[PDB]
Structures are given as structure tokens and as C-alpha cells.
Amino acid sequence: AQYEDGKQYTTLEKPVAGAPQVLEFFSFFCPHCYQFEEVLHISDNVKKKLPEGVKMTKYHVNFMGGDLGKDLTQAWAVAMALGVEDKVTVPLFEGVQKTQTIRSASDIRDVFINAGIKGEEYDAAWNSFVVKSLVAQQEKAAADVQLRGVPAMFVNGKYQLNPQGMDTSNMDVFVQQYADTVKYLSEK
């Protein structure tokens, strides 16, 4: 067919029941994740083509960047809880990979402060049990698919995107092939 199992996507041998409909994993340490998010805008273009009623989830992972990597997973939980993902995604990516000015939990906190989150609110969220359960959700979802690399996208806990079998000569064309493929999988 046009969309072949083992080509543009693979099927999980062990389907994950109860999984989010569209689930993306990334790391702020991940160079291809920086490309995906800051240059290609994969999440946004997938969103614009998803059928009505299909929600998008994006989680951070621990297996890159050691201690700071784990701090970033907790910070991403704070971002999700406060609903400020769209305010901190760019300065966190640029802080880790472009300026290399994020070296501690306090440097992470500075990004939220600069983005207009009050110090008191950030600190409250950072130590909250709501954030601890969000951290748990991120770890569990990665564990459910035995995740060992990013970026990664899963659809209905059944299908995993396979971008390596795609022409990347043109960035726009690649992004829309990726998005059209997620849409196809979402309708499967």
C-alpha cells in the first residue's frame, strides 16, 4: 500500500491499552528534538491535521542528560500543570542547546521567571504532589513502550512513527508527510 507497516510506521508487538491518542516524547537535550520542535514544528503541524476530538500529549524523558535531564522532566511537569508549555519550550531548548546557559535546577527556574511565572507559583508547583503525579505519568508512558530514543511519536498505543523512511530534502514536504501519516494512523 501507500502506508506500509514496517515502512512509515511500525506496529507495537505489545499494544499499550489506555494510551493517549497521539503521544510524543522528547528531551530538551535531544538535538533532533530541537530540530523537530524549533525548525520543523512537528507538534504544531500534526495538530493542525488531526481529526476533531483527537488530543495531543507531549512528555519529556529521563534517559538523556543525567541529573539535569531528570530536573527537566520535573520542570516539564510544572509546565503542564501551569499550562505554560508554549511559553517555556523555546527558551528551555535554546537554554540547553543554543546558549548552553541551563546548568542547574535554578537556571531552569530562571527561564520560567523570565517567562512571567511568579517565583512563588513556580516553587509551589515544583514541590506539589500534582506535579509528582505528572512526573509519574511521564515515566510510566515511556516505560509502557520500552522507550530508548527520542524524538518518538505513538498513535493509540499501537503504532510508532518511522520518519527514517522519508525524504528530507524539503523540510515542508517532510513535515506534511509526517502529519498526514499521523492522521492516517489516527483513522486506522
Side-chain angles (χ1 to χ4, degrees), residues 140-157:
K140 187 185 178 276
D144 282 344
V145 296
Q146 298 91 2
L147 190 72
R148 141 202 56 193
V150 283
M153 190 166 302
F154 297 86
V155 177
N156 293 316

Side-chain angles (χ1 to χ4, degrees), residues 22-113:
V22 180
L23 182 42
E24 185 178 343
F25 293 95
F26 77 110
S27 170
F28 284 111
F29 280 94
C30 162
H32 291 154
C33 303
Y34 187 110
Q35 292 304 318
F36 262 44
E37 176 63 20
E38 303 298 304
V39 178
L40 300 172
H41 309 284
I42 290 286
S43 297
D44 192 44
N45 278 275
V46 167
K47 186 182 184 31
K48 295 178 318 89
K49 274 178 170 178
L50 285 180
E52 176 172 15
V54 180
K55 94 191 277 172
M56 303 209 35
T57 307
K58 172 145 34 175
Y59 289 157
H60 195 265
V61 302
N62 295 336
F63 57 81
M64 298 185 77
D67 214 285
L68 249 193
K70 264 204 97 147
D71 274 326
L72 284 158
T73 297
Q74 184 163 351
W76 188 246
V78 175
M80 290 190 287
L82 297 179
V84 294
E85 301 97 319
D86 296 341
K87 294 168 177 189
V88 300
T89 293
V90 165
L92 287 170
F93 264 120
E94 297 196 346
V96 176
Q97 293 190 49
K98 182 178 184 191
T99 61
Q100 299 189 350
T101 48
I102 296 176
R103 311 176 210 96
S104 65
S106 174
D107 300 330
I108 300 176
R109 178 176 185 276
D110 287 346
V111 166
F112 284 73
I113 301 304

